[PDB]
């Protein structure tokens, strides 16, 4: 039986090290990485400030791609958009919304053509009004060392525009136009739309399910250049 | 490395099984018990959704019942057999149903009259003894703790805890000859006289004590209770 507790005490760790992989909300992450930690304790026998305890930037560390740095630089950026509303203290887990405009004028995200939609996918309500964890969950997504599969998801989401949960050729029209305002003509991008629809569509609805998007993104990879932003 | 981690968790396992195994043994209260067994218990139907193996009762869950026989010497049908004679005693304060764990206490001067204590030179200081406040208000944990100490599948040590402080009657931690003296005279339920009992206990404490004080502390007691086991009598009982 010891090789079950060892196998289990494995799976636990192999959980702990990627829900940062996760196309999952900060505090869904923190509670499955503090359950994996439990079972491990119980069963195996950096500057200082005042923004955040070290719990929760070793938290933060262990849910996302960003080191302790990182979020304190994070918080000072989300801090200078809403210096009113934004609370120098989260030692408490305050809760606070910042609107999307005030989000989508950020030099990392102002020349995006999907910024509000990014903005909303990280938002549960899907209005943007985001707090500071699903700031960092955005930025996390979309830093260089997130996963290509876990960019995919929120691509997905995000590309939706017709919110079917489905990607088909309106879907798509729309998306390659954003991503191509100076370079396909209205009448290319159907063309090219339909052809990349067609050799991914398997079971003949014109609509593509994540499986099948995830594929389409493998060939055709610069429909995930949208998700490399760096902070 | 690998032959260390093994090895570090075999230790582990190991551990949480003695625990769950003698936390029945312990001088502890029913709470912490079941907190200490619930730390430790963590990891250690085909054609049908219901499991195989075969609710006869309305009183207790049965996961709180699990936590009876795991924290006690008493099984089950003795557990919901302690509960009747419970409610026996105060019919009208004692609930029928435990299953949200109510808090009730009833007063010492009915548990006393139970017949298995009312004979009991040291009924009131038993009762006492398993109640948090020292006044014997026992919840039904209390009452079960009680007898879980008297039965006779508790070890000499668990009882020898109690005793020691039941006989400690100037509550200084230790035995002398003044507790013994008047713990002897309950004892001997007058078949001794007064001489006779300082005489029984002069030397009694002299032969088990070890640091020269005439005062007994737990270790020379257990040696004095070896030599001497009717000073046990008062802790065995049976419901
Ligand atoms: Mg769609
Ligand atoms: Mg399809
Ligand atoms: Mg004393
Ligand atoms: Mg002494």
């Given at each position: 039986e010891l090789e079950r507790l060892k196998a289990e005490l494995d799976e636990k760790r192999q959980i702990i090290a990627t829900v940062k992989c996760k196309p999952w909300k900060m505090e869904k992450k923190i509670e499955v990485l503090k359950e994996a930690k439990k079972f491990v304790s119980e069963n195996e026998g950096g500057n200082k400030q005042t923004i955040f305890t070290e719990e929760q930037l070793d938290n933060y560390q262990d849910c996302t791609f960003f080191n302790k740095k990182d979020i304190l630089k994070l918080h000072s950026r989300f801090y200078e958009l809403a210096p009113n509303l934004?609370?120098?203290?989260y030692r408490k887990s305050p809760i606070v919304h910042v609107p999307m405009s005030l989000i989508i004028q950020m030099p990392e995200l102002?020349?995006?053509?999907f910024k509000e939609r990014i903005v909303a996918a990280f938002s549960e309500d899907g209005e943007?009004?985001?707090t500071f964890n699903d700031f960092v969950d955005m930025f996390s997504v979309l830093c260089?060392?997130?996963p290509r599969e876990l960019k995919a998801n929120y691509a997905f989401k995000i590309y939706d525009?017709?919110?079917?949960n489905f990607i088909c050729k309106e879907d798509l029209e729309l998306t390659l136009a954003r991503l191509t305002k100076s370079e396909l003509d209205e009448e290319e991008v159907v063309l090219v739309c339909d052809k990349v629809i067609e050799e991914a569509?398997?079971?003949?609805?014109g609509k593509l399910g994540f499986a099948d998007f995830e594929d389409m993104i493998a060939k055709a990879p610069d429909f995930l250049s949208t998700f490399h932003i760096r902070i």
């Open positions: 934004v609370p120098m203290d102002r020349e995006n053509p943007g009004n985001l260089e060392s997130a525009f017709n919110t079917d569509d398997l079971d003949g609805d």
